[PDB]
Structure formats: structure tokens, C-alpha cells
Amino acid sequence: MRILLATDGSPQARGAEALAEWLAYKLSAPLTVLFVVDTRLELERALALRGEAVLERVRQSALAAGVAVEAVLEEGVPHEAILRRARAADLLVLGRSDGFGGLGSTADRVLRASPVPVLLAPGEPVELEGALLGYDASESAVRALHALAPLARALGLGVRVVSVHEDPARAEAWALEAEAYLRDHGVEASALVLGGDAADHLLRLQGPGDLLALGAPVRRLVFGSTAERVIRNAQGPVLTAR
Amino acid sequence: MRILLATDGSPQARGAEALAEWLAYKLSAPLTVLFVVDTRTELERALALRGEAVLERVRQSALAAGVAVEAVLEEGVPHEAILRRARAADLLVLGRSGGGLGSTADRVLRASPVPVLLAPGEPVELEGALLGYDASESAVRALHALAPLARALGLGVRVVSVHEDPARAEAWALEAEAYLRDHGVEASALVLGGDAADHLLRLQGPGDLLALGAPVRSTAERVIRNAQGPVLTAR
CATH class of the missing domain: 3.40.50.12370 (Rossmann fold)
Known part of the structure; x- marks a missing residue:
């Protein structure tokens, strides 16, 4: 690697x-x-x-x-x-x-x-104590999921999977699919099924010691998307994939 | 995995x-x-x-x-x-x-x-492996997907880069070649001119794994449609 x-x-x-x-x-x-x-210059x-x-x-x-x-x-x-x-x-x-x-x-x-x-x-260093994944089963979320697994495993970090949708049934299927994959790759994980605003949750859930992984597809690389607000306000390291 | x-x-x-x-x-x-x-x-x-x-x-x-x-x-x-x-x-x-x-x-x-x-329909164990590489996003995906498979099966990888400008093909082949060696795989680039599709098809023996990037929509299609051996695709 x-x-x-x-x-x-x-x-x-x-x-x-x-x-x-x-x-x-x-x-x-x-x-x-x-x-x-x-x-x-x-x-x-x-x-x-x-x-x-x-x-x-x-x-x-x-x-x-x-x-x-x-x-x-x-x-x-x-x-x-x-x-x-x-x-x-x-x-x-x-x-x-100011860019993305x-x-x-x-x-x-x-x-x-x-x-x-x-x-x-982030600007100021820090120690990685945990990790989280924003997952909706979209192609870029899948790539983020796959990218995160090996790192989480090697660094000994548990992973809190975070799915957000109006329908709790949809969000539960996503969280579980990802939790299953992480477990199948020797990673300890949980599934958080929530509603409301995704960026708010992710920003609430991540402290400076957490690595947040999330897909950042080109169609959502515009000001205002969930990924855009998270990265801009992220307190800790953020892992992105497309 | x-x-x-x-x-x-x-x-x-x-x-x-x-x-x-x-x-x-x-x-x-x-x-x-x-x-x-x-x-x-x-x-x-x-x-x-x-x-x-x-x-x-x-x-x-x-x-x-x-x-x-x-x-x-x-x-x-x-x-x-x-x-x-x-x-x-x-x-x-x-x-x-x-x-x-x-x-x-x-x-x-x-x-x-x-x-x-x-x-292919007819079974067979993989004895060799080759990669079609042009530094495009798909090829990079193919490149990265191949490495772990090749090393785990102990297979050398023939890196094939084809272009009109040999200097360009060369740059590609060496990039793919260094990546693989950096990832514990033995590899040697084959820099060519002419038609990528035919070379790749000619170079693949039914016992060879051919890796290339999947089409955005072509070289890839031609190869996938005529492959006589196992093909690995990535996008």
C-alpha cells in the first residue's frame, strides 16, 4: 500500500x-x-x-x-x-x-x-480513536466503504455506520449492508439509523479524534451538498472517494 | 476479500x-x-x-x-x-x-x-497474466485490481501499453510496471505501436488473465467480445 x-x-x-x-x-x-x-505564480x-x-x-x-x-x-x-x-x-x-x-x-x-x-x-494533528462511515449504498459510498475497511482494520478502529433517510426501513438496510461488509473484513461495527439532516448528524457524531469516511461524487461536489458541508466543517480527518 | x-x-x-x-x-x-x-x-x-x-x-x-x-x-x-x-x-x-x-x-x-x-466456458488454471494499460482512470482501476490477484497467485504480469507516440506508450508502461513492483509483483512492460486490441488479443493465451479497464461506452469492447481467456475488468 x-x-x-x-x-x-x-x-x-x-x-x-x-x-x-x-x-x-x-x-x-x-x-x-x-x-x-x-x-x-x-x-x-x-x-x-x-x-x-x-x-x-x-x-x-x-x-x-x-x-x-x-x-x-x-x-x-x-x-x-x-x-x-x-x-x-x-x-x-x-x-x-474558496472552492469545495x-x-x-x-x-x-x-x-x-x-x-x-x-x-x-485538519490543521492541528491528533490521535485517531475511532471512525465512521456515511453510507447510502450509492456507488461512491461503496467505494468509501471499501477504502475505509482496511484502514480501520489496520489501525484497530471500530466503525459507526451512519445512514440517513426519511424512511427508517431504507436507512436500516443501508446501515446493515455496510456493517455486514465491515464485519466480513475483520472490522468491529455498528449501524446507526437516523432521519433529519445527514450533515448535522455526521458533524455531531465526529469529534477531532474520529476519521469520517464518505463518498463525494462529482454531482455532489457543489456548494451545499451533504459532503460539502461535512468537509467544510469537519473537526477530524475525512476520507473521501468517488 | x-x-x-x-x-x-x-x-x-x-x-x-x-x-x-x-x-x-x-x-x-x-x-x-x-x-x-x-x-x-x-x-x-x-x-x-x-x-x-x-x-x-x-x-x-x-x-x-x-x-x-x-x-x-x-x-x-x-x-x-x-x-x-x-x-x-x-x-x-x-x-x-x-x-x-x-x-x-x-x-x-x-x-x-x-x-x-x-x-471462458471451458475451465482452466491461470498460469500467466497481462494488463492493457493507458493511464486512463479505468486502466488505473484495472492496474490496482490486478496487483493483489497476481501476487496471491504468484503470477508475473506483462504490462502492455500501445500508442502511436512511443514516448507516450513508454511512460505508461513504466508507470504500470513500477506500481506493480512497488506492490510485490514481478512485471515487465511491452511497449508497442499499432492496434492495442489485436495485440492484447494476440498476446493472451487461454491460460492468461487479461486485465483492462471497462468501457465508459472501443478497445475494451473489442477485447471483451473476443477474449479467448479469462478477462478482469474494472471501472
Whole structure:
């Protein structure tokens, strides 16, 4: 399992960088760190001088942590490079820093065409104590379900499945289908059947210590969707898939 | 990893039944066999009876082969059931036809949430494997789906990239090649020009697993429609 960390050196990305090194550490997986000198913005040597620095900073912080790491410097449009590099990965980790969920234009573009799940980390690091899954049995929820299972299993996290619908019978079938799958993959889980507003529940249910997984399909990558409000207001790490 | 085998019983499914049971035994993965009485008083008891004969038949084989197995009898439309049950699986296995893409298989492979393995009618153990790769989203999906299967079956993977511009084909082949080696699979790229479809079809021996990305709607169709060996599709 190969992890890809895309960081822009900023302080807001410190969380993502930290969460990637920890994940690589736990999962015992190799880690690739990518800095993309935004050529768009001579003085370029300045934007490029820092990138190398940001890399060595992150690179050795991991080398020390005992994580197989490789640093990669590149120049050009960030999301373009991030998306290309993602094909050689299984999990993509980004630092939060109006675009989707206020993640900015770059992170916004990545989420729109990433070949793999995308982990959105909060600014301030933290310890993963649990996990949850927003599930409605839609294609992107299924991918989120499948992406979450191995991570939950390896990190020892129980998973609270969260289904929301006007009809409790529909929502119960979804929650159970997903709970069954997680159990069939060695994950401890429960099914929460609720009504009302999905984003409210998910935001209520997730503390800074919880990893929330949810599908984020292109048709719901617009301001106002459930996924959009969750990611924008998420307190802890969010795992998305399409 | 959960493997879902969809078998209609016919001879044109003995290949899927064996491959599925074989993949299960080899990956120590639970197998879920599904039979669907195509409803679409009389025939009822008859069809259902057979379905249970087919299911009970595959079950004993899996057991005798030492594989955690489960059989399910469903009533309704085949693809709708298979696609629904597919949500709880990681890999799906169907027989080519009721000798190519049949009604069901075609609907299924165009909408499955997970990799679809189409097996020929005539059984056979996988000895080799190849991947058609062009760096498209579907191919990346195929690439990622293949790796775990190849390593678990101890199979080398011939990575095939075909384009007019060799520099482009090269970039693709090496990308797919490095991914596999990074995931503990032996692989060597074959960079070509010309027609991808014919090369892939020419290169696949009935004992080879050919992986490629499923069509968005073509290279993929041509290959899936003429494959002489097991095909693995992903979207």
C-alpha cells in the first residue's frame, strides 16, 4: 500500500503531513512526499528554494520516524502533478489549505478527478480513536466503504455506520449492508439509523479524534451538498472517494 | 476479500465456477455463490429446484475443496441481483455467456462497483497474466485490481501499453510496471505501436488473465467480445 502526501509547506498542512507519516508508520507502508512549485505564480528560484526545504523537513521527520520515504520536487500546476502522481498511489493525503469545502482551488480540483481515495486532514494533528462511515449504498459510498475497511482494520478502529433517510426501513438496510461488509473484513461495527439532516448528524457524531469516511461524487461536489458541508466543517480527518 | 460467483448452471459457466472456487482456495477467501431464478405455479418449482441443485452442487465442491462457502438463491432480474450483491463483494466472477458477452454479463460489467472477472466456458488454471494499460482512470482501476490477484497467485504480469507516440506508450508502461513492483509483483512492460486490441488479443493465451479497464461506452469492447481467456475488468 503506497501513500502519497502532497504538501504546500504552509502551517495549515502540518496536520496532513503529520497524519501521513503516522499512517505510513502504523500501516508500515512506503511514503511519497510531493511538493509542487507553482510555476504559474528569476524569482522562481525562491518558490523552488523553499520546496526543497519543505521536502527535507518532512522527509527526515519521517526517515527518523522509521518510515520508508521518498521526496519529490516538481514544477507546474499542483493539482495536475498531484493527480498524475496519485496513479502510483493507493491513498492520497492533503492539508486543508474558496472552492469545495473551502479547501481551495487546488485541493478542489484533486477531489474532482483523483484515481484514489483522498484523505483530508485538519490543521492541528491528533490521535485517531475511532471512525465512521456515511453510507447510502450509492456507488461512491461503496467505494468509501471499501477504502475505509482496511484502514480501520489496520489501525484497530471500530466503525459507526451512519445512514440517513426519511424512511427508517431504507436507512436500516443501508446501515446493515455496510456493517455486514465491515464485519466480513475483520472490522468491529455498528449501524446507526437516523432521519433529519445527514450533515448535522455526521458533524455531531465526529469529534477531532474520529476519521469520517464518505463518498463525494462529482454531482455532489457543489456548494451545499451533504459532503460539502461535512468537509467544510469537519473537526477530524475525512476520507473521501468517488 | 469476499469473492462473489454468479452462476446460472449451464456449461457456459463451469469456467466461472472453477475459477471462482480456485481463486477462493488460493486466496483463502470466502466465496459467495449466487443463483438467480429469472422469473421474467409451474416453471417456478422447476427453476428454483435447479437453482438449488446448481447451488448445492457448487457448495459441496467448495467445501470438498476446503473453502468457506455460502449459497444464495434469488428471485428477480439477474443483473439487478448480481449488481446489488456485488456491493458486498470485492471481486465478482461470471461466465462469459448464457461464445461471448451475454445479456447479463454485459449489463453487470458496465455497472459493477467492483472488478469483474469474465471466465471462458471451458475451465482452466491461470498460469500467466497481462494488463492493457493507458493511464486512463479505468486502466488505473484495472492496474490496482490486478496487483493483489497476481501476487496471491504468484503470477508475473506483462504490462502492455500501445500508442502511436512511443514516448507516450513508454511512460505508461513504466508507470504500470513500477506500481506493480512497488506492490510485490514481478512485471515487465511491452511497449508497442499499432492496434492495442489485436495485440492484447494476440498476446493472451487461454491460460492468461487479461486485465483492462471497462468501457465508459472501443478497445475494451473489442477485447471483451473476443477474449479467448479469462478477462478482469474494472471501472
